[PDB]
Design a protein around this ligand. Structure first.
Ligand SMILES: [Mg+2]
Ligand SMILES: [Mg+2]
Ligand SMILES: [Mg+2]
Length: 335
């Protein structure tokens, strides 16, 4: 069925399912639609024989250069996507809800890539985008398929961040702190202003664009301090680096970062250490440092994230596309 966003009861049940599911994703939370306020939300779900929600998909519809919309369920749906027969049923609900307005319904769940799963999906009629598409560019997957994920369940007795690492790494993490770097965290306007300054500075330094502050303000309005937290690293009165982490489902996700120019005293390591400590303190299963371009030392993202994730990066199935308008799809989506 389709969720009536104006039905508080229905919304609460949908949210409860999302928040409690081991497959929950912040980008599938109804709060994500508030962040992506320029996209149209269309949410659907399936119920089991007891009438309880067993699967849900929060879609966001965006415009394209054609008469069709692009329907996207970021890191959704929320269910065991390998249960493809169940997935088909949920997608059928989504297709009904879209009512021919979209040329495609795409979802990129955080499930490991495998030839078997890839094949099963294709056998069910989905078009998958992973190893068959470009690594970067306008043809690449929206979300990086290679992600550096720290599995904290491998360290049941870990009390602090240092307990998860080899001595060489403990040294790297301790460095900023011994040099005076201090981290404070929260989700108020003050921390947001600190984040934004480092974020725009970082953007200007790398000659790249940055999202407007309103984007993050909507995020702050949508998520409480137990879900969204901004970590700010400073040294004796000087702002050095920041990071935004979102706690949801089985993980804490390092989503945004910023760092001032010049000497930052390895503040980014301090930020990571505190985000990981938050994951430990909350008994979270995973700490997701996000994507990398490649598992190579030539990738600055990899080198940095590899300090905190020694396991191989997780490689996801990529984009699973339910093609609705084949002609427009072929026009807008290519390898
Ligand atoms: Mg258009
Ligand atoms: Mg713990
Ligand atoms: Mg590790």
């Amino acid at each position: 069925p389709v969720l009536n966003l104006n039905d508080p009861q229905a919304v609460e049940r949908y949210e409860e399912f999302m928040r409690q599911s081991p497959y929950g994703q912040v980008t599938q939370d109804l709060g994500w639609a508030k962040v992506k306020n320029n996209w149209e939300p269309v949410d659907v779900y399936l119920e089991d024989d007891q009438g309880a929600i067993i699967a849900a998909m929060s879609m966001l519809l965006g415009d394209t250069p054609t008469d069709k919309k692009f329907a996207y369920a970021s890191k959704g749906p929320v269910m065991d996507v390998t249960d493809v027969d169940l997935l088909d049923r949920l997608v059928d609900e989504a297709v009904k809800a879209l009512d021919g307005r979209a040329y495609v319904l795409r979802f990129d769940p955080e499930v490991a890539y495998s030839d078997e799963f890839n094949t099963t999906l294709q056998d069910h009629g989905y078009v998958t985008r992973n190893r068959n598409v470009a690594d970067a560019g306008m043809h690449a997957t929206i979300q990086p398929r290679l992600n550096m994920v720290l599995d904290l369940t491998k360290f049941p007795d870990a009390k602090t961040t240092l307990d998860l690492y080899p001595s060489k790494t403990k040294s790297k993490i301790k460095r900023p702190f011994r040099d005076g770097v201090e981290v404070h965290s929260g989700n108020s306007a003050t921390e947001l202003d600190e984040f934004f300054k480092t974020y725009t500075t970082m953007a200007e330094r790398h000659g790249i664009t940055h999202r407007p502050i309103e984007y993050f303000q909507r995020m702050q309005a949508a998520f409480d301090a137990d879900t969204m937290r901004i970590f700010v690293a400073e040294r004796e009165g000087k702002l050095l680096s920041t990071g935004i982490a979102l706690k949801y489902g089985r993980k804490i996700w390092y989503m945004y970062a910023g760092s001032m120019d010049g000497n930052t005293y390895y503040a980014p390591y301090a930020v990571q250490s505190e985000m990981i400590q938050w994951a430990l303190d909350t008994n979270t299963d995973l700490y997701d440092l996000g994507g990398i371009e490649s598992e190579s030392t030539d990738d600055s993202l990899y080198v940095f994230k590899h300090v905190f994730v020694k396991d191989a990066p997780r490689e996801y199935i990529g984009e699973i596309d339910k093609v609705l308008d084949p002609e427009v799809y072929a026009e807008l989506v290519k390898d």
